[PDB]
Symmetry: C4
Subunit: 31 residues, 4 copies
């Protein structure tokens, strides 16, 4: 269950990287 929790936290970190990707996209629209 700890190693299910770590691999939920990895796919939270992936959906923060998708944070990062939108924040280059908005900074084209605004930068």
């Amino acid at each position: 269950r700890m190693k299910q929790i770590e691999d939920k936290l990895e796919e939270i970190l992936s959906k923060l990287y998708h944070x990062e990707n939108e924040x280059a996209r908005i900074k084209k629209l605004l930068x």
Copy 2:
């Protein structure tokens, strides 16, 4: 407690999807 933690992580993932919807709403205002 592990399967309480996994179901806090699910309702963090839900509030990243609300990330996603706001980052659609801001791209109507800016796109």
Copy 3:
């Protein structure tokens, strides 16, 4: 340690609510 982890996840959820607060403030600047 599980109920330390749950209360790190509470203070991640709080800093997603600060997500919501800024996505109110940017939507004043743009809405």
Copy 4:
């Protein structure tokens, strides 16, 4: 593994502080 999970949660919180850094930078482009 609990104290591996807490230290994934710290490096999630760090990548939320980077939320905070960008939401200073966009609030220069817009404020």
